Amino acid sequence: MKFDNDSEKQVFDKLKKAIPGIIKEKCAGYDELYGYKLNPQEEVDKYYDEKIADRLTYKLCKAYQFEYSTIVQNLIDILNWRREFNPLSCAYKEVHNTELQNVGILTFDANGDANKKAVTWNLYGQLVKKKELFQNVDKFVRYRIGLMEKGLSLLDFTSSDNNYMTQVHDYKGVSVWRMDSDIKNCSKTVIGIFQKYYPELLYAKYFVNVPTVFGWVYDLIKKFVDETTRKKFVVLTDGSKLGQYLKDCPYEGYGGKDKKNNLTKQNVTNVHPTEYGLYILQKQIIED
Ligand code: HEM
């Protein structure tokens, strides 16, 4: 991990040591981040990887430009949200509307390009049929955070080639007339969460099978994300070009190199929470 000048490595050194008190006085002792433990009760012999805890707080300094007092304030807002909301539970415990699970695909390519080995896919174009999934906003957002968290169970935060995620939206089928404020409302809601609570986890996001009559949509949505993640956005009118960016995505649809199996056959279904993730979840269900 690289510091531009000592003073940045000094806010890392300070933050790393402030974490116990921070977590304890203001987060209420919850220290599950992205399925890993970051709070050194000496079971911690067992479930505390230091280099993972350290890369994740690096990740949070980078996100907030090594401005100390901003880092801690958002580290609080993240950890509290992880308690009040339950992101781990959205992925591994809750039941989600069935037509929704079918449009969330999760794939991993052990030999893929850096930070394009873990990908999640939303087949949102399939859901212009069904604009009732969007009236109950909260249950959607719980579905999607569930896919977000399952994606990160596939990352290796210690690595340099697999500590970020890639995401594809397939909008094949959207009609430019059916763009009602229900959809606007789910988008903006999820977006706020990704922005406020999942920073420094996206590498690239591809939006494929999008006609050019949709420019006004793309312009309006983008005003809800920061320049940092906006620079990672790519819009593809022709979905078969996707293999030019994801080397091992399915040949069918996505022009990729895997001609054996399509996207459905590429899915991952064994999802299996992280070690600490499981602890947090089962210990939660004795104090009901
Ligand atoms: C009409 C059907 C659509 C639905 C249901 C939909 C749904 C969503 C949702 C739920 C999100 C936020 C998080 C995501 O799920 O990962 C999102 C984000 C976004 N959408 Fe769409 N969308 C639609 C159409 C479009 C179109 C036509 C465009 C034009 C390019 C577009 C561009 C974007 C962009 C740039 C974001 C921000 C993603 C990010 O910040 O991570 N969407 N959309």
Residue numbers in the entry: 1 to 40, 45 to 292
What does the published report state?
The crystal asymmetric unit (ASU) contained three molecules of Sfh5 with a single heme-Fe bound to each of the chains. Sfh5 adopted a typical Sec14-fold comprised of eight α-helices, five β-strands, five short 310 helices and a β-hairpin turn. By contrast, the Sfh5 helical gate was shifted by ~18 Å across the cavity opening relative to the position of this substructure in Sec14 -- thereby describing a ‘closed’ Sfh5 conformer. Again, in a strategy conserved across the Sec14-like PITP family, Sfh5 residue F228, located at the C-terminus of the KKFV gating element (KPFL in Sec14 and Sfh1), engaged K192 of the adjacent helix A6 in a cation-π interaction to stabilize the closed conformer. Only ~8 Å2 of the heme surface area was solvent exposed -- as opposed to 835 Å2 for free heme. In that configuration, heme b exhibited twenty-five van der Waals interactions with amino acid side chains of the residues that line the cavity, including residues F138, F144, V178, I187, I195, F211, V212, F218, I225, V229, and F237. Bound heme-Fe was in close proximity (2.3 Å) to the hydroxyl group of residue Y175, and tyrosine coordination was consistent with the results of safranin T dye-reduction assays which estimated an unusually low thermodynamic reduction potential for Sfh5 heme (−330 ± 3 mV vs normal hydrogen electrode). The Y175 hydroxyl group also engaged the Nε2-tautomer of the proximal H173 via a hydrogen bond interaction. Only two amino acid side chains (S191 and I225) reside within a 5 Å radius on the distal side of the Fe -- reporting the absence of a sixth coordinating ligand and establishing that bound Fe is penta-coordinate. That vacant coordination site on the distal side of the Fe represents a candidate substrate binding pocket positioned close to the Sfh5 protein surface and to which access from solvent is occluded by the side chains of K188 and K192 of helix A6 on one side and residues L224, I225 of helix A7 and F228 on the loop connecting helix A7 and 310-helix T4, on the other.
